[PDB]
């Protein structure tokens, strides 16, 4: 079982407190600050209450030589088109693409099924002064490196280039910002931003 492109999955972060222990699947909404936070799981009783906004569709799966290589190519460049039919090469990058197996250390590109938007890296961290952790978001483009998570091993049993299992917990971190995916207590509750500290991530098909 390994986790493929376009695959419908959720992200789920164990968190542990005050002798208490709970699931989380990242959450997000396509309206507002488009700001992503955690839902609670199974409390009442099976699975998040709402399923849909822990949705996330993995779009993308490349190493991240080839996409910031990508990025590079499209910052002043008349050259690199795929699609020169464009439909004819556009048929045959996306029929030759994939349709892919994630591999430990590639970034990938999440999108929020529910908003359409990707999971992003905001540049604001709107938590403290110290800019130690940034806010998680939804953003509407791709362009750039905050919508890429490179996925890590959780333990040394995964290594770089392998393949990802389903139920592999992963360790997200943001390309722009190169800060974990990190599972944060705010008040009295579980927040979702890119810190310095990781957190290890359940990536389920669902």
């Given at each position: 079982?390994f986790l493929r492109?376009?695959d419908?999955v959720?992200?789920?972060?164990?968190?542990?407190?005050?002798?208490?222990?709970?699931?989380?699947?990242?959450?997000?909404?396509?309206?507002?600050?488009?700001?992503?936070?955690?839902?609670?799981?199974?409390?009442?009783?099976?699975?998040?209450?709402?399923?849909?906004?822990?949705?996330?569709?993995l779009?993308?799966?490349?190493?991240?030589?080839?996409?910031?290589?990508?990025?590079?190519?499209?910052?002043?460049?008349?050259?690199?088109?795929?699609?020169?039919?464009?439909?004819?090469?556009?048929?045959?990058?996306?029929?030759?693409?994939?349709?892919?197996t994630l591999?430990?250390?590639?970034?990938?590109?999440?999108?929020?099924?529910?908003?359409?938007?990707?999971?992003?890296?905001?540049?604001?961290?709107?938590?403290?002064?110290?800019?130690?952790?940034?806010?998680?978001?939804?953003?509407?483009?791709?362009?750039?490196?905050?919508?890429?998570?490179?996925?890590?091993?959780?333990?040394?049993?995964?290594?770089?280039?392998?393949?990802v299992?389903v139920?592999?917990?992963?360790?997200?971190?943001?390309?722009?910002?190169?800060?974990?995916?990190?599972?944060?207590?705010?008040?009295?509750?579980?927040?979702?931003?890119?810190?310095?500290?990781?957190?290890?991530?359940?990536v389920?098909?669902?």
């Amino acid at each position: 079982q390994f986790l493929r492109t376009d695959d419908e999955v959720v992200l789920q972060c164990t968190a542990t407190i005050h002798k208490e222990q709970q699931k989380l699947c990242l959450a997000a909404e396509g309206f507002g600050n488009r700001l992503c936070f955690l839902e609670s799981t199974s409390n009442s009783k099976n699975v998040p209450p709402d399923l849909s906004i822990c949705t996330f569709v993995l779009e993308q799966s490349l190493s991240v030589r080839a996409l910031q290589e990508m990025l590079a190519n499209t910052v002043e460049k008349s050259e690199g088109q795929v699609d020169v039919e464009k439909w004819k090469f556009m048929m045959k990058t996306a029929q030759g693409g994939g349709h892919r197996t994630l591999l430990y250390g590639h970034a990938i590109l999440l999108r929020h099924s529910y908003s359409g938007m990707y999971l992003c890296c905001l540049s604001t961290s709107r938590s403290s002064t110290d800019k130690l952790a940034f806010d998680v978001g939804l953003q509407e483009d791709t362009t750039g490196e905050a919508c890429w998570w490179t996925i890590h091993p959780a333990s040394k049993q995964r290594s770089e280039g392998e393949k990802v299992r389903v139920g592999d917990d992963l360790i997200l971190v943001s390309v722009s910002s190169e800060r974990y995916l990190h599972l944060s207590y705010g008040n009295s509750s579980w927040h979702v931003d890119a810190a310095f500290q990781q957190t290890l991530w359940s990536v389920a098909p669902i």
